[PDB]
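Input:
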Amino acid sequence: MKLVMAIIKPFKLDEVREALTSLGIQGLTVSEVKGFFLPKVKVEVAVSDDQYEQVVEAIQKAANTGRIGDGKIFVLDIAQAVRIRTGETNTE
Amino acid sequence: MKLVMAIIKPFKLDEVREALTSLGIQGLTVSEVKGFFLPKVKVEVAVSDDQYEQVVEAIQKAANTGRIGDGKIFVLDIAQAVRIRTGETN
Amino acid sequence: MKLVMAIIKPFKLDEVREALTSLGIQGLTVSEVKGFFLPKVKVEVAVSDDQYEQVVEAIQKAANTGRIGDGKIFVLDIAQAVRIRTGETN
Ligand SMILES: Nc1ncnc2c1ncn2[C@@H]1O[C@H](COP(=O)(O)OP(=O)(O)OP(=O)(O)O)[C@@H](O)[C@H]1O
Ligand SMILES: Nc1ncnc2c1ncn2[C@@H]1O[C@H](COP(=O)(O)OP(=O)(O)OP(=O)(O)O)[C@@H](O)[C@H]1O
Ligand SMILES: Nc1ncnc2c1ncn2[C@@H]1O[C@H](COP(=O)(O)O)[C@@H](O)[C@H]1O
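Output:
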């Protein structure tokens, strides 16, 4: 499992959300941050190792303008995940 | 150490905090985030290897309702933790 | 690559930014968070493996007061980084 974190230009949030939803990705978490400043949006989603490359590609293509300030996507390893509703624990 | 990250329903924060305090945790970081919008709370706490699973389970039990939208808890490895007050590691 | 995450007293942000800038690190992400509450600032910066320890030390020295509430620095491994502007993987 991977945590995919992207810092994007705020106007690109709708396109990024759209791209992820088409991939069938659920549980997008979004926050407003300051980018060094200019307002940025941080998007975060946890995905299977099987899905992370498609997720990264989808975010990159949706968030891209080619101009300065486009931002970054960081992928981090998740060792364990628990579904709070059921208490069930998953690992890959 | 491990970074325990949970995305919970905002009204569950008090119960989650109470459970963590009972474990002797106390130090934790809370962010206001948006789920998909629905308001959510992101709780982040770095915990020793000896206690991380107990922290996960404490958060799970406290944040649980059995309803849709309860959220998830993620565990990530921390390679190095520094206490800013003293500069000590891990 | 490493993700350096620091939770600091808000008034220390400028000093931390100055230290990072002197190291040639201008790109960083700042969030307003709640620390258990008191307002805190989360600084996130992805840095190369060869520089992360120098970065951690620089942040610690700039953010330190020696008093309670100074905060924490966590270092996490980054599995992959992509530059959105070009689509290139680090
Ligand atoms: N190394 C980094 N660590 C953390 N956040 C970063 C980092 N680099 C960039 N960011 C975030 O991304 C936002 C946009 O910066 P970006 O990645 O586009 O860098 P840049 O200096 O504009 O270079 P370029 O756009 O040409 O790649 C920043 O304001 C910051 O919020
Ligand atoms: N284990 C932790 N996990 C996540 N965030 C933490 C943790 N410990 C501290 N923090 C964050 O750092 C902020 C400052 O707390 P700090 O680390 O200074 O702890 P403290 O109890 O004041 O101890 P001391 O300052 O003596 O080290 C907290 O309010 C919280 O946002
Ligand atoms: N895979 C995921 N990655 C990151 N955050 C998630 C994920 N799934 C759910 N969330 C967050 O948790 C909230 C409730 O999710 P859930 O209870 O799992 O439907 C959502 O609104 C998201 O903000």
